[PDB]
Nucleic acid binder design. Sequence first.
DNA 1: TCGCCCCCCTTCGGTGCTTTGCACCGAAGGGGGGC
Lengths: 406, 552
Amino acid sequence: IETVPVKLKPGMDGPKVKQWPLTEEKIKALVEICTEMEKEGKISKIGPENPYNTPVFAIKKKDSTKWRKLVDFRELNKRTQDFWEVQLGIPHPAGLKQKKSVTVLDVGDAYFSVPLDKDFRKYTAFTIPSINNETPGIRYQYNVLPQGWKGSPAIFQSSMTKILEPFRKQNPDIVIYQYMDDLYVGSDLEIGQHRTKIEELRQHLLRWGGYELHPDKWTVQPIVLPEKDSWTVNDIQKLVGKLNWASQIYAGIKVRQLSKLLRGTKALTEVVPLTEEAELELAENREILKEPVHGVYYDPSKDLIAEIQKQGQGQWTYQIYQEPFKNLKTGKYARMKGAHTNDVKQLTEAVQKIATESIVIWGKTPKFKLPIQKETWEAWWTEYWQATWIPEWEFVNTPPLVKLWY
Amino acid sequence: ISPIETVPVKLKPGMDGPKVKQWPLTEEKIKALVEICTEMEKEGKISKIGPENPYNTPVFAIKKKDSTKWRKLVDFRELNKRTQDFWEVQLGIPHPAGLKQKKSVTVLDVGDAFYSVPLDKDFRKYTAFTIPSINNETPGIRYQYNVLPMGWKGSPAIFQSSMTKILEPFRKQNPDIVIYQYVDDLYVGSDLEIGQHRTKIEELRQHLLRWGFTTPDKKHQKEPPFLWMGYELHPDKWTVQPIVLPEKDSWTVNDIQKLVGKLNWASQIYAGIKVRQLSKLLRGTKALTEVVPLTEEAELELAENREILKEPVHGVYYDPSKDLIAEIQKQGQGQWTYQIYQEPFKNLKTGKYARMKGAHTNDVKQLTEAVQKIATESIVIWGKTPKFKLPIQKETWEAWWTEYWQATWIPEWEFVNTPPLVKLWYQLEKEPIIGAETFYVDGAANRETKLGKAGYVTDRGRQKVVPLTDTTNQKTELQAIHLALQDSGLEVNIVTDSQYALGIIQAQPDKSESELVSQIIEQLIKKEKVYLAWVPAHKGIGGNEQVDKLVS
DNA sequence: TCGCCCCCCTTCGGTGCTTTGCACCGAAGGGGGGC
Ligand SMILES: Nc1nc2c(ncn2[C@H]2C[C@H](O)[C@@H](COP(=O)(O)OP(=O)(O)OP(=O)(O)O)O2)c(=O)[nH]1
Ligand SMILES: [Mg+2]
């Protein structure tokens, strides 16, 4: 079988990212997974003369209790040639976000059937760590299309189409979208009936060689202004500051009348009656924030960015944009676990869901601005990750001047 | 020399080998060098070369801990820069607290370890060197390495990798025997009886010998205490090898640097070590030979450490059937010490956390950082996180992660009452305070001017402006809040337009590298109720507009 | 007059911000320890 030649981007070198510490159970799972991939020729043992490395870890879903090996190829993907230029990329179907139910299937194992350009394999190196450093790290590199590498769906594109064409013409209104190692398959059938034909697609791919989503019920959360019958100076300050911030987003929002209402040097608790020409501004700007912003369209040539804010009692607001103040989506995430007390687990789950929605809607994940200390996130996040992909992120400390999303 | 296959290595693209020249050496290092080289050549470790090879790298010799023997070193700094990058496979240092108790223990070390691993044939010409006769009466002999040389960037990783390959057949065949492998030092523990254990050792040594790795008797430890990785391993406990702290009448910067490093090394088993006051002496200095007089605090800190170090201590070994427990105590000035144990009063190890992260922070954040450092160390050593015992009330932590806007968390922990407890030193009110004065604060500086003003106006008619010199925009805004807290009563409402100042204060810091922010913190702690509100500037908001009119 | 690894403490310089200094962060200097 013949391989496809692949390059890094001009002036880029391969990844050189250090392996981080792993629990006993993850090291064990990685050793058992990698020794069998070794036997099946998917990976090969290497030594230190390969100067590249990418961190490896493992996840174990509650969906399926077997351990899944996860190599964080984010750095390699950033340095790999784009496949829109190579002319072997994957188009996103706009009908996916319409469907009643979308099931995610992990199909990464199909990549192991196609070999990787022998000159590119050295960039896929990873190192298994050692409990109490009893042993030096153990290094492998891929011989086949690796899971988590953005070139694997691109190279496997021609095959997967032939594998799917029978199913999709026997089912012309089910839509299938391949993203990284995943298939997002959406239909408009009853939630049990839909699952029956997911079972049929799995057993169809099984002869050659999940998560239940409902995009119809993903609600956008707008900027709501509070409604009281009596208003203090501080209430009006808070309101004027909120609307002033929203004047960078929405069109024609006014505050001069309320600004005048706070004239003088007043006590923050002094209740101020609302002017006839002040009450109008509120309900007038209430309805500018009613329904969406005009003139904001998705551009597939630019990155998606997601901001998240902790709002307390399990609530998390988020905005997805490409240019500042031009939000393509605003939302509120809320989850039930029954632990009641884990901020990092909630944020990790909020990231996966937001990133999942962006895959369904636009076909790619956004870069997250995470409201968390870098070291707190890195101490715990892998314990809650359940996706076969990993989005890009950065860490911001986020002093909330305005109470704008909640 | 091992028959193992060599690791291929390359020079970085576009580069050549080193052409550096030899320097004089004492004609007692030379005799040792010639004794090593003439014997290395007879074993095939080096080969004579000639003028067709135009490379060279200087040589020297230092003595080994076994006092009688010498160590041959090549100053390959030039070759290393031109040599390809490697991925280092040594990821960390094994710790004795991670060992389980074993019935039978053996410690082995390989003789001439690096010299038993062959070097890439095409790379050998670049290792050219020349051993010197005193006074240059005769020209020196040129050689090249056929094996891994001491001083080359690639030698450690290539040896470690090769040692791992050689050991793997023995490990797979014997999963009941633990082999800690650090470079060429092999710790071998098992639960076999002494007779069967020694048979396994004899078999391991013979396997190493077939692959070219000798195990000399001088380095074959068979009885406790075992000297290993800087420790002493007893059957039931382990100790660190003796730590001798320097004692000086006059201290230089460099002396203090060594002192702090020794104390850090000691802190892994000696509880309560502190180094903040001694390390403060290192700040702002500009020469390692500069004499630094110890401050009174540093003398006290040093004397406390000396008291702790005079006591005998030991760690115990890891019992996988019992929980790991980590207990933390606060020591003051952002210093924290911890102990990790499974049964009470039997420490596996200790440690300390004292890093100052960020310009402004509080004890709750730093405790969280200590927990994260301990959690990472636990994964490294034992492969799991411990249960924590923390000197912080549950109500305190709960008030923190509800009030603080960033996500934060701590794993399973139990409150332990060991004062001083970690607490929040103030909390901003979530609503304005009725009957409290309302201060509208503002500060402004001139960007090119370096002069500014801070001040306030008040719903009770009070007002104040102070002119500031050599200040910034952000400083004047902090200064304006400083004045409001200074002139107000126990309860105060403060309105600012500086998102910067609000961001700092709303995170409830209790310590700061800025003396201005520390003054603010001290005033916040003495208050009874504080509500801090923000409004946008230059939008003529009632109150803020007047104080901004007045800072002009 | 060397190499590689982990740790801590301090300094410095690059990055991004609807900034003009500030906070953050990674690298590099010093030290400890290991072979
Ligand atoms: N470049 C360099 N490498 C060292 C140094 N100390 C130890 N090593 C490396 C090279 C050694 O061959 C290897 C094992 O260390 P040893 O102290 O056991 O020396 P070696 O085995 O070579 O001789 P010996 O054990 O005395 O028979 O670790 C050093 O100071 N500089
Ligand atoms: Mg040795």
